[PDB]
Design a protein around this ligand. Structure first.
Ligand SMILES: C=C(CC[C@]12O[C@H](C(=O)O)[C@@](O)(C(=O)O)[C@](C(=O)O)(O1)[C@H](OC(=O)/C=C/[C@@H](C)C[C@@H](C)CC)[C@H]2O)[C@@H](OC(C)=O)[C@H](C)Cc1ccccc1
Ligand SMILES: C=C(CC[C@]12O[C@H](C(=O)O)[C@@](O)(C(=O)O)[C@](C(=O)O)(O1)[C@H](OC(=O)/C=C/[C@@H](C)C[C@@H](C)CC)[C@H]2O)[C@@H](OC(C)=O)[C@H](C)Cc1ccccc1
Ligand SMILES: C=C(CC[C@]12O[C@H](C(=O)O)[C@@](O)(C(=O)O)[C@](C(=O)O)(O1)[C@H](OC(=O)/C=C/[C@@H](C)C[C@@H](C)CC)[C@H]2O)[C@@H](OC(C)=O)[C@H](C)Cc1ccccc1
Ligand SMILES: [Mg+2]
Lengths: 332, 334, 333
């Protein structure tokens, strides 16, 4: 199939973090997840594009799930770097329609629900931590749920994996929150605001104020509060990973979680978050000897990163008691 | 505890920097069987390569080598090669060969018999067509993969289907050998050896040595890229072969060299340094370092990362560019 | 349990190398080994503290196994960095007393035997290679034996693991010897001598003489002799590791052994041992694509490190033949 070849070309051209682990998935999961990735990428590209007015955008978000069944549908007006997935959408939708119906049902349901949620947030910033969870559920939690439903529908994993939507949602939330935290500065420069207003406003008058070097102390305090919030999903991440029985699915799920945890640990109490590039420095000697492909190794890696954070908690930090508590819970 | 076997492991380690440790890690009877297979093929290789041995002396040595396995006093004292201790003390090696179970002797002798004929056939001639390149690689490397695969299955650590699949075992060997030949252009040219297929190189230059000259660099790189594209064709068979394996020790032994060869092709792709000496197999991307080459899905993911490392660098102007994209695309969708 | 939470806090704060792998252990092994670590660390903290007189220290070491059973016992006079495990010992011992009886038997047995052995060595240095094994047995071999007994008691591993005490002892001796070899200079400036006198005295008048630049050739020869001694434990290490069936136990056991082997290879015939800290080099290409989490990979990594030593054995070294011989035995087995 030349259209499937094109889809895999687009996957590799677009995804640095997931292309390899997706292409390594066993059997039918590989095409189902490749197509799921591309279709959500097309949806995201619409969401992100500030040249599409809110009034024009909402009906596209709302109806995107149905465009999967309109063989000629494409979008030619995107100004985004990845617009090829929208311009050549018929190639992707054709391959979506070639998936077994059980996978189509999952992918279309997720697109529909994600479209509704993305549309809700076009006109508003994130206010409370509860709203943060809602926004993250819409753009990432639902991805974890959809992937889990595909794993179960394929029979490569237990039915519990797709049924336990709270655990799957946590998988997505941990990744999205980590990205939001790490990307403060890049988002500030693109005029984007994802840090929850009810948290940041306790520190500064404007979210952009964290980029000013005179506010670095308060910035790092807010940073630490948000990291503490994200750490709450780690028990569910461990539970989720602990239930997987397929090696290719385990690799696909575990590697990105471990990269996120590494990233949160590097960002903890780190002024660099507000100043530029934060790179992961190599871990404890013991954990360098293992990779993230069996559960005891993944747990050890996670515990090492939790101690890297725990060790750095400033007594003066306003979240310090809470940071110790969640880490202690993760350890329990 | 056997002094002759101890000596064979000494020779394995004197000669092999990169296979010895994974051979020694093999389960049960495969360990000795593959150690001995390595040393016997090493002795044959040393004869093939020794340019001080006249062709008319060399042909019978290569043809009859499999017979020497059953001649307890046979040795060869006239080699000038660096690995000649395996020929000079061949009786120690053949003694340990004759201590192997018959099922392993049968495989090893059969491969030696067939390899000797193939090696003898190529003494007077260079590789012309790509089909001849496959034939030569079959004789000196494909047959190694086939022999190993038959040893795995004879030991019963692997399913009989592993030894049965001679076509994909052959591809495993071809992939490694073509990678080596590609990488070692310059070392070979300085030793007066020509392994690049004439039907390919002669479309660029008048002599193969012409690629060593700095004025021919663009052409040399184009030919390099054409040969790499040829070698990438074995990757689907490599993936299928490795996917069938069920023994961890066998898996590590087979998968690690394939991944290293893919890493080598990626470092060599479109790389002028091939014609100036040694190519540094670089450090890979973030996702790559998160996994090792010891389970099949991780091996697949590593392979795909390297395929994208090549794909991203294909120059539009390269004469093989659509073909390189095509084979990578096939590997991705398999 | 807030006391169990505290024990894990102490585990993470103290153990840079073992906290993560301990916490990753399956089922009942996790608490059993976390507690085993904390109590042995407490015992070690008493042993190490040069401000505690021998008069006071002997009864502390002898009676330590019984303090596990005395709910109010603590020690408030430590001047060591890790004194919290001593000052808050009742928290650790409460959790100890909550372990299954089968685990308590093992932990208290090792604490009793280690305390006795540690006390023997307060008044003396290590003389013979046999005394070196005895000392390492007391402070590391018994840890290997205790851990192996916990694995078998938990039934995550076969009975053989805890039964074969010689193999478990070798696991401990290999680590301990590697550490002592590596740490020559740091111990020399701490006023500590662990290199066996019957070996070093064949080279120099005083152990500290190896730190003097003019003595470097003799120092390196002695280093190589001791390395050769430690390599004799590798067959047992391979036998031990090859018997493990549990992934979490395998990770916990194999990684330290591989790091020790890498360290010995980095130290072999290396003058830097006597000038400070030794760089553990980037490994041979084939091994860089493997981790230490399955047995064939661990074998290949160990075998590769053996060849790195072998390659470096110079003919003029007085132990050269012995070093080749042990490596040759490990290759062929
Ligand atoms: C659009 C989406 C992602 C856009 C994205 O853009 C990048 C870019 O434009 O550059 C990207 O292309 C790149 O970085 O190359 C990247 C990629 O690599 O894929 O893709 C990025 O990946 C990460 O950020 C990963 C971060 C943690 C794993 C690691 C730590 C370090 C921080 C947590 C991501 O930002 C998602 O959809 C929605 C609705 O969000 C998927 C389609 C959902 C899905 C995922 C898997 C299967 C199926 C569907
Ligand atoms: C003679 C032969 C090889 C000569 C060879 O000479 C080298 C040298 O002369 O120096 C070598 O000695 C060295 O490098 O030390 C080396 C070695 O290491 O063993 O041996 C080399 O190998 C590698 O380097 C391999 C590296 C991978 C890990 C990654 C690569 C493939 C990425 C590109 C190889 O060139 C074969 O016989 C024939 C007929 O070919 C074997 C006996 C066949 C066999 C193999 C296995 C089991 C049984 C039999
Ligand atoms: C006191 C003890 C340890 C003192 C120790 O102090 C360090 C410090 O004070 O800094 C330490 O805390 C640190 O370095 O952080 C450290 C740690 O990491 O735990 O702990 C150190 O360990 C390593 O570095 C080991 C590195 C290998 C993985 C690789 C090496 C062998 C390559 C050469 C160690 O010196 C033992 O008891 C006795 C009686 O000795 C345990 C309790 C015994 C036990 C072990 C496991 C389970 C149960 C019991
Ligand atoms: Mg059991």
């Amino acid at each position: 199939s030349s259209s499937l070849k094109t889809c895999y070309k687009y996957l590799n051209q677009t995804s640095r973090s997931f292309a390899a682990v997706i292409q390594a998935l066993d059997g039918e999961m590989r095409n189902a997840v490749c197509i799921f990735y591309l279709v959500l990428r097309a949806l995201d590209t619409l969401e992100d594009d500030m040249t599409i007015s809110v009034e024009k955008k909402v009906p596209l978000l709302h109806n995107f799930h149905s465009f999967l069944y309109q063989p000629d549908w494409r979008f030619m007006e995107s100004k985004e770097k990845d617009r090829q997935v929208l311009e050549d959408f018929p190639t992707i939708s054709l391959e979506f329609r070639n998936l077994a119906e059980k996978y189509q049902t999952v992918i279309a349901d997720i697109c529909r629900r994600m479209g509704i949620g993305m549309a809700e947030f076009l006109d508003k910033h994130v206010t409370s931590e509860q709203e943060w969870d809602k926004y993250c559920h819409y753009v990432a939690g639902l991805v974890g749920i959809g992937l889990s439903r595909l794993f179960s529908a394929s029979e490569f994993e237990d039915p519990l994996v797709g049924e336990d939507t709270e655990r799957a949602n946590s998988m997505g939330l941990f990744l999205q929150k980590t990205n939001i935290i790490r990307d403060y500065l890049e988002d500030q420069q693109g005029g984007r605001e994802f840090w929850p207003q009810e948290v940041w406003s306790r520190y500064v008058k404007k979210l952009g104020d964290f980029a000013k070097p005179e506010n670095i102390d308060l910035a790092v305090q807010c940073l630490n509060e948000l990291i503490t919030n994200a750490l709450h999903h780690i028990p569910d991440v461990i539970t989720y990973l602990s239930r997987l029985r397929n090696q290719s699915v385990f690799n696909f799920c575990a590697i990105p979680q471990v990269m996120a945890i590494a990233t949160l640990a590097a960002c903890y109490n780190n002024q660099q978050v507000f100043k530029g590039a934060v790179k992961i420095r190599k871990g404890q000697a013991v954990t360098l000897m293992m990779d993230a492909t069996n559960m005891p190794a993944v747990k050890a890696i996670i515990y090492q990163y939790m101690e890297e954070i725990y060790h750095r908690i400033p007594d003066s930090d306003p979240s310090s008691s809470k940071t110790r508590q969640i880490i202690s819970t993760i350890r329990t």
